Design a protein around this ligand. Structure first.
Ligand SMILES: [Zn+2]
Lengths: 480, 67, 94, 323
């Protein structure tokens, strides 16, 4: 068949087998839908100056990608190397880019992980096709897209890392996904939802006694929120809504149902939202009560016609942190496994005191981010020069933009031992001005011994009852 | 002919954009070893006869015969 | 324990440094079991021994440099084993 | 010499079983017992041995000299040409006149240009066709006459692979095997003139396919023996019992670096430099150089009438974590 016709029949086979869901026959009625999607995005360019069908690009499955690929790769779908550069080097100057690759990615989007030992919510997000499952990250996410099947434009894959055992890459996305399923128009909350406004709701957060009659729903502008906290079994994160700002009252709330954990990814500060089917709880010793989500809670965006308001020192170096909020872009790394970074170079940035792990596999130069409620310190220990931000649970970290820059090289000297820095912080509970030095030390010991007298993954391993870590014993007498 | 001419023109565009259609030549990037060799040009290069490098196929034979 | 001179030497990246243990005050180190290990020492002394071989004519010249002919400099350490800590490199294995 | 007489002792090797961990692992023949170097010296050649050593020194120190081209058919190394050599080749094509009967054919079609300001240089481009039809760029074999080394390289970064040619009265022919018989992105392929018996571009009809363009396949079609890329060096392997000077000569085994690409990629060059300065750190005493276990063979040479007994390394690679 003709080049375009051969491309089309290859796409037919690809759809039928690789993509057509087990829930539905290898329906050919699906093929015109995806054909229309590729045609749309390709011709709507105009700049494409191409055949009706983009024959240059090709189709790749999840498992296909997983087995075959191991470089970072970008499908800046339907863009020329000129437009690509104009996007890639906007994270420049000299932003070492991902490579331009002409692939098309089609798959189902869900929170459900590939594991079935539990629900395995863990606030995680994944792409699934007939071939395999893969985790993904998505700026300005829309939760409605859950469970739906899409074409993905302007998409990027990051490979697993040499040091990492799980050997899993992950996806990064730059634009809304297009559903193969025709536009699924659905109604909205016509009736004004009965919600408690922030003043009455906060008075209730003090006077937990008066939670009767007024519907257990809420609304307001998101003023404050935690990072996604995890216990050893429970996971949760806290948020607060204000009538305005500066406002007399803000309503603190906690999300805690495992299935709802994904909610965390969606919200954003300032934007006003609506919460539903709530209660107020008294966590152990937390006398200032909070609203909490139930088995039936739902979260929604706020819209005027959709609400029904309801009202009832050189002499003593002990120095102070300055709470603030900030945004910008990281510009390097000083110790990836521990968690240090240079925000625009000007200002030190730790990150240790979070659960943090979820942010590792993204964080790299050219990443743009926003911080809310974050301690700032100066003149810190170890003679370190710059000021240092240092988010903590009462704060939260927010992505502005993924980085067009590809990751740098591996090197055992840099890549190893995250568990050890973490173990220090949580078993010993140091304070940051001591933790900076407690890095620089192990960075100097592993400059003598390793690898020759002893290899890193023997020296820096996280100390365990089965064996103490030499990277802990050597410091202990000074530290303790 | 639209598709055919489009394809041949993509090829011709690659070629011409790569070809120095006018003006003087330009210097391509140079790597560490290449620049160092160029700077060292005048050095007599290290080399070894292939004889010292196991031209003795008989020794190869009786070696591969060993367990 | 180094092969050439017997003298207990400390060796680590970039080179080596001679040393002079003492089990405890007025008693010498006594069991071979202690070769191989890591010793962390922080209450120790660092010595030198300048072996100059100048040729000054008169005391006057001592005010000047232009008469020294050679130079060397022993250097080493010494400490008790009540102060430093011994650490047994766990027999390296995968 | 006061301190020299002591340095003559202080720089000696130490013994044969330290605390420190090896730097190299032999992939095969691990069952072989360690044979002291002295024991080897006292024995005949050829023979296999498994040893441990430290590199007292290595050659060439100027590591840009550590790669060679090798022709296996006549087993004889070949020095790598310089860019000045390529330029001395290509310069003769810049002035040639294209021929009308070499432009468009059943196998290839062409497009022409005259580059201005460059002394009136003439250039012609030819595109090979699959089953008579131009294939996509990823499978488009392209031919050039009059293009410079940098231009053909940048063009090979774009097309599948490209062949320098000149106007042969019958059909296009490689302008000079001193220039690449095939330049494939970062790889410049060279051949052995003594072993080659080349053919014209029409002989691409002998290929099993016109889409893969496997360098070996196209070489065979154009009747050219492709040269192998190899690392080659010799090392001072000291054991205290004795010191031995073996040879290395391989492609992407020990170093685990492609000898084919290392010349054109700077990261690989950094890597190999790191490896060698790690086995042999600058300045400090061999007292601190790491142990190196490997597997070697011995053999005769007799290039100077007799003996010249020699040793070569085999089946050994740098450990993973020490890279
Ligand atoms: Zn040959």
């Amino acid at each position: 068949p003709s080049s375009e016709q051969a491309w089309l029949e290859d796409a037919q086979v690809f759809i039928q087998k690789t993509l057509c869901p087990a829930v539905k026959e290898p329906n050919v009625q699906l093929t015109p839908l995806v054909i229309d999607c590729v045609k749309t995005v390709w011709l709507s360019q105009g700049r494409n100056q191409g055949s009706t069908l983009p024959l240059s690009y090709s189709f790749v499955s999840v498992q296909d990608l997983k087995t075959h690929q191991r470089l970072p790769c970008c499908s800046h779908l339907s863009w020329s190397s000129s437009a690509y550069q104009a996007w890639a080097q906007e994270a420049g100057p000299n932003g070492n880019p991902l490579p331009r690759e002409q692939l098309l990615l089609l798959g189902t989007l869900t929170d459900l992980s590939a594991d079935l030992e539990q629900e395995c919510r863990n606030g995680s997000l994944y792409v699934r096709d007939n071939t395999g499952v893969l985790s993904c990250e998505l700026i300005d996410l829309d939760l409605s897209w859950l469970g739906h099947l899409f074409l993905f434009p302007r998409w990027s894959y990051l490979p697993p890392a040499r040091w990492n055992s799980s050997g899993e890459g992950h996806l990064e996305l730059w634009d809304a996904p297009v559903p193969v399923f025709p536009l699924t128009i659905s109604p909205g909350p016509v009736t004004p939802i009965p919600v408690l406004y922030p003043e009455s709701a906060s008075c209730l957060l003090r006077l937990r006694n008066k939670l009767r009659g007024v519907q257990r729903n809420l609304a307001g502008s998101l003023v404050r929120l935690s990072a996604l906290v995890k216990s050893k079994q429970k996971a949760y994160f806290i948020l607060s809504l204000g009538r305005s700002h500066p406002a007399v009252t803000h309503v603190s709330i906690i999300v805690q149902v495992p299935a709802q954990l994904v909610w965390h990814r969606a919200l954003r500060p300032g934007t006003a939202y609506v919460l539903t089917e709530l209660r107020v709880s008294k966590i152990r010793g937390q006398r200032q009560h909070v609203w909490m989500t139930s088995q039936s809670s739902r979260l929604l965006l706020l819209k005027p016609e959709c609400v029904q308001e309801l009202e009832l020192d050189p002499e003593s170096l002990v120095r102070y942190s300055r709470l603030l909020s900030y945004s910008g872009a990281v510009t390097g790394v000083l110790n990836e496994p521990a968690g240090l970074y240079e925000l625009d170079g000007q200002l030190g940035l730790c990150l240790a005191y979070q659960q943090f792990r979820g942010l590792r596999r993204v964080m790299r130069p050219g990443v743009c981010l926003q911080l809310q409620d974050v301690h700032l310190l100066q003149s810190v220990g170890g003679g370190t020069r710059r000021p240092v931000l240092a988010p903590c649970l009462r704060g939260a970290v927010l992505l502005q933009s993924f980085s067009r820059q590809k990751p740098g090289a591996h090197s055992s000297r840099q890549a190893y031992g995250a568990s050890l820095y973490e173990q220090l912080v949580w078993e010993r509970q140091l304070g940051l001005p001591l933790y900076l030095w407690a890095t620089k030390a192990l960075e100097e010991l592993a400059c003598k011994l390793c690898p020759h007298v002893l290899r890193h993954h023997q020296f820096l391993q996280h100390s365990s009852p089965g064996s103490p870590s030499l990277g802990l014993q050597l410091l202990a007498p000074t530290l303790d | 002919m639209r598709e055919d001419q489009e394809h041949q023109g993509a090829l011709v565009c690659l070629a011409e954009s790569c070809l120095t259609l006018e003006g003087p030549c330009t210097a391509p990037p140079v790597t560490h070893w290449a620049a160092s060799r160029c700077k060292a040009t005048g050095e007599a290069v290290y080399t070894v006869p292939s004889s010292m490098l196991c031209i003795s196929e008989n020794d190869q034979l009786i070696l591969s015969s060993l367990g | 324990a180094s092969s050439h001179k017997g003298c207990l030497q400390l060796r680590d990246q970039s080179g080596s440094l001679p040393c002079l243990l003492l089990a405890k005050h007025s008693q010498p180190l006594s069991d071979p079991r202690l070769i191989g290990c890591l010793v962390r020492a922080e209450r120790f002394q660092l010595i030198v021994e300048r072996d100059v071989r100048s040729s000054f004519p008169s005391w006057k010249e001592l005010s000047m440099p232009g008469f020294i002919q050679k130079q060397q400099a022993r250097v080493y350490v010494q400490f008790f084993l009540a102060d430093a800590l011994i650490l047994p490199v766990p027999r390296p294995c995968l | 010499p006061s301190s020299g007489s002591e340095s003559d002792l202080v720089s000696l090797y130490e013994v044969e079983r330290c605390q420190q961990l090896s730097a190299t692992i032999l992939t095969d023949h691990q069952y072989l017992e360690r044979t002291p170097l002295c024991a080897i010296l006292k024995q005949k050649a050829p023979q296999q041995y498994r040893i441990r050593a430290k590199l007292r020194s290595y050659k060439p120190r100027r590591l840009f000299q550590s790669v060679k081209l090798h022709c296996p058919k006549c087993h004889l190394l070949q020095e790598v040409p310089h860019e000045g050599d390529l330029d001395i080749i290509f310069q003769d094509g810049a002035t040639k006149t294209p021929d009308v009967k070499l432009q468009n054919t059943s196998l290839y079609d062409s497009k022409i240009w005259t580059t201005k300001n460059q002394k009136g240089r003439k250039v012609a481009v030819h595109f090979v066709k699959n089953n008579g039809i131009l294939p996509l760029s990823n499978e488009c074999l392209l031919l050039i006459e009059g293009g410079t080394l940098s231009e053909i390289c940048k063009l090979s970064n774009k097309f599948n692979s490209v062949i320098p040619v000149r106007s042969g009265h019958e059909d296009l022919e490689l302008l000079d095997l001193s220039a690449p018989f095939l330049i494939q992105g970062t790889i410049h392929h060279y051949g052995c003139k003594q072993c080659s018996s080349l053919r014209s571009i029409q002989n691409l009809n002998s290929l099993v396919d016109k889409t893969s363009w496997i360098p070996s396949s196209v070489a065979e079609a154009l009747g050219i023996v492709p040269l192998q890329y190899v690392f080659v060096m010799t090392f001072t392997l000291d054991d205290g019992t004795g010191v031995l000077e073996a040879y290395l000569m391989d492609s992407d085994k020990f170093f685990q670096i492609p000898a084919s690409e290392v010349l054109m990629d700077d990261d690989l060059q950094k890597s190999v430099d790191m490896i060698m300065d790690m086995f042999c750190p600058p300045g400090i005493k061999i007292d601190a150089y790491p142990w190196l276990e490997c597997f070697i063979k011995s053999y005769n040479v007799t290039n100077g009438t007799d003996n010249q007994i020699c040793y070569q390394i085999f089946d050994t690679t740098v450990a993973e974590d020490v890279i």
